[PDB]
Design a protein around this nucleic acid. Structure first.
Length: 87
RNA sequence: UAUUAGCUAGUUGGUGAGGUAAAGGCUCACCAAGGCGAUGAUACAUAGCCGACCUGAGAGGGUGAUCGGCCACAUUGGGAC
RNA sequence: UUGGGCGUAAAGCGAGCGCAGGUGGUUUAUUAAGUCUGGUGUAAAAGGCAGUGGCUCAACCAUUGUAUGCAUUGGAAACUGGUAGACUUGAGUGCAGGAGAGGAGAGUGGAAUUCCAUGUGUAGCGGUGAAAUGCGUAGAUAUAUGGAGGAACACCGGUGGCGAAAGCGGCUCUCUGGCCUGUAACUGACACUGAGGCUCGAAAGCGUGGGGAGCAAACAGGAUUAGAUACCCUGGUAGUCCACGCCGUAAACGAUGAGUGCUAGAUGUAGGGAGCUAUAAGUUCUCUGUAUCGCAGCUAACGCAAUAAGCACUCCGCCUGGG
RNA sequence: GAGGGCGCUUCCUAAGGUAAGACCGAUGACUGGGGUGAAGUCGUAACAAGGUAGCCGUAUCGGAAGGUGCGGCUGGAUCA
RNA sequence: AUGAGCAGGGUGAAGGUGUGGUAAGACGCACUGGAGGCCCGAACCAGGACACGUUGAAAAGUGUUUGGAUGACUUGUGGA
RNA sequence: GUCGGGACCUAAGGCGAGGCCGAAAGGCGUAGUCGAUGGACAACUGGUUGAUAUUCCAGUACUAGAUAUGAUCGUGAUGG
RNA sequence: AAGGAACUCGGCAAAAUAGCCCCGUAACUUCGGGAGAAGGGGUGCUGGUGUAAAAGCCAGCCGCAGUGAAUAGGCCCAAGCAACUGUUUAUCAAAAACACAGCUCUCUGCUAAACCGCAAGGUGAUGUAUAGGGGGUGACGCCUGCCCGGUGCUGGAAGGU
């Protein structure tokens, strides 16, 4: 939910490999971006429950995200806790 | 039986001592606060248990009679030599 | 379990998440955990499969063996598990496309209803099978206009789309998910689920505060007939609408859970991808969609059948004769 | 003198009382529902488009079958 | 209108804060924290009951209990 | 002188020329005027009688003014 | 004494309990409370040791009695009424009476309505319909049914008066 400049910008900073636009770190970038760039829209009127279900499937995408980058990979996130540092 | 949820106070660890045939809160003193439990702990009903044995082709269901083993008991309850 | 069913006969939660828990694309090697082999424990027994003798032979007893996760320990890498390892070839993320009643707010426009005055004229209108209901001569409806307000937005509109469904259609903005077509650019299995817990959610109604056209529970009046507390008519309260909280129950439906694999075809329609048919035309493949017939399969039958009631497996759930 | 029973208090302490429950049974004036039997009486519904097709969840009015309304589906018709 | 007060002691909210709590809130327990027609209870202000007295100490009491006791309190002052 | 008041201000209020209305008396009321329970401000220790003490006096003040005395342009309002 | 409420219309008065600490605490609940529920225990002194910041320990000494006296709740069950706190006849009566938030209706667009005064003037209130005035009822929960004949009120005007 962002333009191509901040899209490819946040790929550019928050990518750990050039061209790795499907990195788990870039899943953190766009997904962990639009959690708080999702909160703007839930606070927009607090009514769009379909977007609340988007938050459900994207919280779950964060669940597979760091459930996997803690799940099979471990230490490339253990060095990278301070990406945002959940929980 | 979860229409059997939260439960547990010596409770759970540590130290000491008494005991014992012996480690052992086995007890008791003192100092620590844990621990269990919604993947069934406690509370209530019910039960002597097992080898075995009747039936079911077997899977099993069902029983514990009589026999043998263990356990428990000795009008009731509790101590202790 | 062996050795069920769930479309209608009893049954799929009312739908979503993403907690445990369950299940695992391919491959390299280890591991032997489980898995198979050998040694070890095994009922004192009594008991079975046999034999012996015998109260004769009987029945059964006495005997004799046989038959056993009762156990622990060497091997097996073929599977799973684990351990390290690799690839994408599932998933998702990239770059291009579009699409829609997807949601949520912020506004706007017209028709139409009813009402305020209103031209100027006379009993009208109502309704049915008809009228009483009634209103209306205080002279109006109807017709001339302007105003007011709420509601909803005919062809658009469709087996159309989107949304998990519930549902969503005047128009315009705001920020807003979700797919599909292509794509390996990239992660390298991140997958599927889903008890628990959580969220959403018809329809009414309930709370507070508004808005109050038309409609209509409650009730009244008039037919109705034996009777009418009903169908009809005249009305007409709650309520319908707006912000703002709740119930959590609907034929929830398709009385057909979720994931993915397989495959006769005749067939709809979307919107892409590609060709395509060229001096403008019009065809073929591909994907998700949603029908209709019907191969196989299929059931008690009815029927289903590519968006299987056919053939499989993982997550769940239900179901046990009736009241 | 030690030690010794008795001398000698305490500890735990069996039973009995206390209080404030909880559980579970029995029990109970009257009373709510349900089933059974009569074949009284009320009624037209539900069954055919079963006489207003319904069937749900819900609000609300009936002696009662039931009605009115919100919305939904054929397990519905003449065929719309 | 201006002033005066109304000993003490509990109670414990809200509020706030911080960590386990959470995507994030709701939650957990601390910490403040006292608001409160809160409570008890002094002064103070009443008068519920009871006894005494009632030609009474008294033209309305005493004595013992009783209530409120930070309020709609009590009440000075000076006014209408 | 210093304590309380007045010679300061002012609430609540009262009186109220003007003015308003009203048989009259009156009652209202602008300016203004008073009106403390309020707000303005210097003195406090010791002794002292039969009795007065912050008042009499020892010690220290301070406030305000006066006339006596090198200013210097300064004061600076009812206004702000 | 012994006995208890048998007295009485009535445990009326007296009695008895209460302090502080520490346990523990049913019912319903509007979830705060109830509740100090109840019921229970302790409470003196001596030396220690730990109490000074600080109880508890140990032993003993004692005691009829250990907040040695004073001072300081009787409790429980249930029902009706009223919610409550407040206020209430001083020279009788404190309550179920009043009041109260609450809820309801109605009236008033402003030199308000309403009210006081002959008026003037002023309140209402330097108020503007969430305010002001009147009427009902008195939290919270459920609910408020029917009847416009009559009365009153409102509104309308055809005619009578």
């Amino acid at each position: 939910a962002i333009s191509k400049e901040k899209k490819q910008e946040i790929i550019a900073q928050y990518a750990r490999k050039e061209g790795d636009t499907g990195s788990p770190e870039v899943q953190i970038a766009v997904l962990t971006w639009e959690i708080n760039h999702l909160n703007d829209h839930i606070k927009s009127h607090k009514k769009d429950h379909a977007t609340q279900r988007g938050l459900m499937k994207k919280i779950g995408h964060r669940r597979n995200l760091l459930g996997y980058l803690r799940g099979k990979d471990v230490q490339r996130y253990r060095e990278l806790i301070a990406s945002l540092g959940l929980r």
